[PDB]
Design a protein around this ligand. Structure first.
Ligand SMILES: [Ca+2]
Ligand SMILES: [Ca+2]
Ligand SMILES: [Ca+2]
Ligand SMILES: [Ca+2]
Ligand code: NA
Ligand code: NA
Ligand code: NA
Ligand code: NA
Ligand code: NA
Ligand code: NA
Ligand code: NA
Ligand code: NA
Ligand code: NA
Ligand code: NA
Ligand code: NA
Ligand code: NA
Ligand SMILES: [Zn+2]
Ligand SMILES: [Zn+2]
Ligand SMILES: [Zn+2]
Ligand SMILES: [Zn+2]
Lengths: 374, 374, 374, 374
């Protein structure tokens, strides 16, 4: 992996999470029996503008960037107990990343942070459509040749479609992760390449999941603030970013990751959190208090095959960045049993989200208002 | 007997009477030292340009209002509370005071959509002339309008509400005994006076509560379809309308009923169901399945003094008319334990609403999606 | 022709402005369809029997008549509106007769309810259709149930690219009965076959559109209360059911109707009304009062190709059954100009919905609160 | 001068002053015959187990509260209104009355999530000791807590509100002049006292209103980011903070400011923006595009007396901090005419909020999606 500065795995999964991943993968693998295989890829578009020509080495640099994130997701999913699942890239005969070029005949003065997303997305749609790729049904990364004050840094999508936006900078490459010269030059690469890994997670349907007591020496959760520590373990003794078991549970049912072209149900709907959702119900639901935590057990009514369940604790304020999450697998009857803790929590009230993970890639969510103390 | 006082045609289950006594003890402790209320249910009679008042309306609605007043008093007592009910504004002869309001529009200039707002505005002006603010009181607005033009509606909460009805020739609770045909004349009075008693319940903040397995021989729940059986026990062979124990629990914290002028909290807000609501939370919540039922137990976190909790089971479709409810009291720590059943239910999915009753007249509600079978 | 399935006549004449709108909308849609794949979609039919509920006699021939009657109706009504005779295609065998998939549910009627018959029959339809390679989650389907009233489902729900309609069979139900004045009854056949045509409109994404001043002698709008007058002509002074021009405009972008397999955008989302929606905006928007009406003109900002616009006037109460609608086409710049009236309206307040019709089958909707008088 | 009174460092545009004069004439007629208000903004100082009161807090917060009081008065007057501001509870010496409350919890048992509710509960009990109901008054809760634990928040509406802030050693408006470092001491005092003035605006029901093209040399709008420039004149660092004309219009109907005890209507409800709202409707509404702007004119249907109207332009993202607003008065028929601009805007889509200001202190709001260019 050294050619694209492959990141190491700087954490060890808890045995309960590894057992959850193996059971979820067994349930998903049975569901995948007999279904068509997926040929989906994460496509990359580079968008230039009238006074904004392409930056040097962008084809080689983004071959390194995408392959670094690709290997990262692969290595992190494996560290969680899944196979090394990750998105595939469109590669040329030499194994280098295919990059679609798009140009927008507008000067930067006619652009804004509000319009750079839609304008670059339309440009990406046109060039991708010319090669038979529908941006409305695929996962795409849109790279903009724009500066921070105008260009977009955003990610949004779900299991069957998503778009991520980023901006290129001169010499941006994962090889800079080791450079401690000059705010440092590794931290700069950490911010933007880690941000892209984070925004791509959103395009796969992942919300925010912050750090939790069960992983104090694992680095920062990628979907929390791990976008600021991605690859920082290669300099100055840092802890890096790890993919939370709950996020690995969610990605396991994404066709782009599991290589199986499952079909979405007609009632799959957007919700307040990222992803697509369907109605669910409980035959049994129990929230039992413990010291600085909660034991959540019950029985999901299986209207459809489902493989797992994810509980989030979310203090009021600060969006979902300060949340922590715990995963669990569902047996053949839909029963689950997990404990989620917040040691030393003094906020009293806290929001609990409960998300059932369906094999058809949708989710079912309920929200419960909980009081927690010692 | 002068206003044809209705009998009490049902017996409360012992557990519900014990809940009412425990709830009344909690409310009485909360009421210690608070100012007493002088609130009344005010009555306005609205005429229109070509629509003069019907004969005997002052005597007839003196009978109607005292009949509904005595019913609520008798039903609250049958539930285990004191005979709580709304007070009336009476003149020196002990007769109901009725404010006359006039709308300078012919009946042809009216509609079912505008009759409500227009008559309410006319009621505001006449009530303001006597120093009574319609925006902070409970009022019954009687319109001299025929069916299909006039309003029959009720809406409000614990500290304000308005009920709308239309007068008809000879409408009097004495007609409950009349078996002559006009639908007989007793059934007609049952429909209209029962509708007023039902819609007045809405003005107090009550949603719909249909009939339940725990009361098969009590008549029809007033807030279900008991508006069509109110007072029908006085003829033929009918079971009348009874005030559901869960509705009695909610009304006990209404100042108009308990005679105590408590203050509403600043965050009291309207919701999907009638009434005003504030946030709540649970320290423990358990929904345990039983045959054709569910046991709901847990511990409410008491951010404020609270006296009871009401669970509703509501099959999809048909609004909340087909719901059934079970009440329970809260101890000093917020603990509750109830069981709610739906015998023979084959619908599978059923909605469960859980409403904590706060002493400050607000409620805290959650909704859970539940699967139920045998 | 069409006498074999008792083809209905066209008992109304479109207003010239609406036919001109339809032609402009079809020109815009036709340009958008250039180069897009052709559609092979069909309206599939499933017949579900139960343990003590065997199939009724002649159901294969009767529903060949029923489905072909509704098919010819939509074709004739779309043509009467100024479009080509657009309609759904059916799956026919070598003899040209309707294909009906047989499904059996091994459950007695005592194991059914009005809440579960819908979902249970859908699951049975899913299993049998999958056996023939038909995914119920990506097609329009009619599920015919061998269940009686009060237990069986009568429902329609869906959008442009998927939908399901539910109905129940009754002995001898056939469109030939439209002429029968005995008692079977003609009104009986009108109600059930008209309900199916109406509910199929829901499955295509249509909400309710009641009758309007601009069509007083056209019969009852199918999506209003026309389900109760469908085919009531050919029986004495009946005026039938007509397809509102606004409903014809909406169906013209449905692949099942226009035969073009357009792709839905990723952000297509469900809303408060039936159909799928995307964000939109206006460059200019003017609501000018007229006597008992409103002039609505402006300029839609074209984020995507759009062909038409539909305005709804909806008095409060009574759901959207009492609404009236007016259509208008969009020029190449997004300009529109329409007038919508409600003569003699006395409600004062009225809700106005404005829905831009996109060529990709989605819509964009805003709601405005309007006061209207003479 | 004793409390370092701020100057007026901006001049209102003539059209806005005429709007204020017209709005105040309309409000004054509505106030005729209504009872006078004796409301005051009460101040509570909350200490904790290991957090004793800081030195001189009574004199320092007498200076802080009178400074904000004089600020609102001078700014309301500079806007064209009378010098409206909140009244304070003063002792015999004319010094601010500060209620002392104690929380029996060490700082280690506190958090940013609980500091608000816990200190609010402590303030409720002590204010109740003097007959002041926190649920029906405006209160400022000053906490003896450090940053990261203590609360800085404001929330409320016209008839009730609560502001939260934290005390710091030596915090006094006299520090506005100090240019020594701590990052200077005037900037520190500006942030904390400006935050309090800003959060108190939220407690009065004001959302965010950022800066606009019509006031480029007036400083920063208080309800935008003016909390960070409050008092910047007194040390020649910048132009300070000014009260936007749209905010002055909203505050003019607040009893705490106008001294008239008007009654809130029963249907006053919270919404997505701060304040309480009632339904409204338009007889005419026109949004006419101009170069880099929009002309908004029409006729509000007056269901109740209304005095003004406020338009917000809000680009997507960044919350409402980057919005700009324009005010306009309503004549006796509800007619209004304003123009709101965003020069050089390149984002295309922009959100427009339209808020009718009712004399009973509530508002009526609609939201329109607008496309804007040159
Ligand atoms: Ca949070
Ligand atoms: Ca129901
Ligand atoms: Ca309606
Ligand atoms: Ca914004
Ligand atoms: Na390691
Ligand atoms: Na640059
Ligand atoms: Na570093
Ligand atoms: Na970034
Ligand atoms: Na009459
Ligand atoms: Na009877
Ligand atoms: Na059991
Ligand atoms: Na019949
Ligand atoms: Na007939
Ligand atoms: Na959706
Ligand atoms: Na919508
Ligand atoms: Na601050
Ligand atoms: Zn993020
Ligand atoms: Zn009702
Ligand atoms: Zn319908
Ligand atoms: Zn703020």
């Amino acid at each position: 992996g050294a050619e694209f500065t492959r990141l190491p795995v700087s954490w060890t999964v808890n045995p309960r999470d590894a057992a959850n991943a193996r059971a979820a993968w067994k349930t998903l693998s049975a569901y995948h029996r007999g279904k068509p295989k997926s040929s989906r890829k994460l496509h990359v578009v580079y968008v230039t503008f009238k006074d904004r020509p392409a930056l040097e080495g962008y084809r080689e640099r983004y071959d390194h960037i995408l392959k670094n994130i690709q290997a990262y997701y692969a290595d992190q999913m494996q560290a969680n107990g899944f196979p090394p699942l990750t998105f595939q890239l469109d590669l040329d005969e030499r194994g280098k990343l295919v990059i679609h070029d798009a140009y927008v005949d507008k000067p930067m003065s006619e652009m804004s942070v509000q319009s750079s997303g839609p304008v670059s997305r339309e440009a990406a749609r046109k060039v991708l459509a010319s090669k038979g790729i529908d941006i409305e049904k695929e996962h795409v990364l849109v790279v903009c040749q724009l500066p921070d004050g105008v260009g977009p840094y955003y990610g949004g999508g779900f299991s069957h479609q998503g778009t991520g936006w980023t901006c290129d900078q001169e010499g941006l490459d994962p090889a800079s992760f080791l450079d401690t010269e000059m705010v440092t030059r590794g931290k700069n690469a950490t911010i933007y390449i880690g941000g892209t890994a984070h925004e791509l997670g959103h395009s796969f349907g992942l919300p925010h999941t912050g750090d939790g007591w069960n992983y104090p020496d694992a680095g920062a959760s990628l979907m929390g603030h791990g976008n600021s520590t991605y690859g920082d373990e290669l300099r100055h003794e840092g802890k890096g970013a790890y993919l939370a078991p709950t996020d690995a549970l969610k990605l396991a049912s994404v066709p782009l990751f599991n290589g199986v072209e499952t079909e979405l149900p007609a009632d799959a709907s957007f919700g307040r959190m990222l992803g697509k959702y369907v109605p669910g119900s409980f035959e049994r639901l129990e929230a039992i208090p413990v010291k600085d935590g909660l034991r959540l057990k019950g029985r999901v009514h299986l209207t459809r095959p489902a493989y797992g369940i994810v509980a989030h604790l979310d203090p009021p304020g600060g969006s979902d960045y300060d949340s922590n999450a715990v995963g669990a697998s569902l047996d053949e009857k839909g029963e689950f049993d997990l404990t989620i803790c917040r040691p030393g929590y003094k906020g009293g009230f806290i929001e609990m989200r409960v998300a059932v993970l369906n094999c058809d890639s949708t989710r079912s969510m309920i929200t419960l208002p909980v009081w927690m103390d010692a």
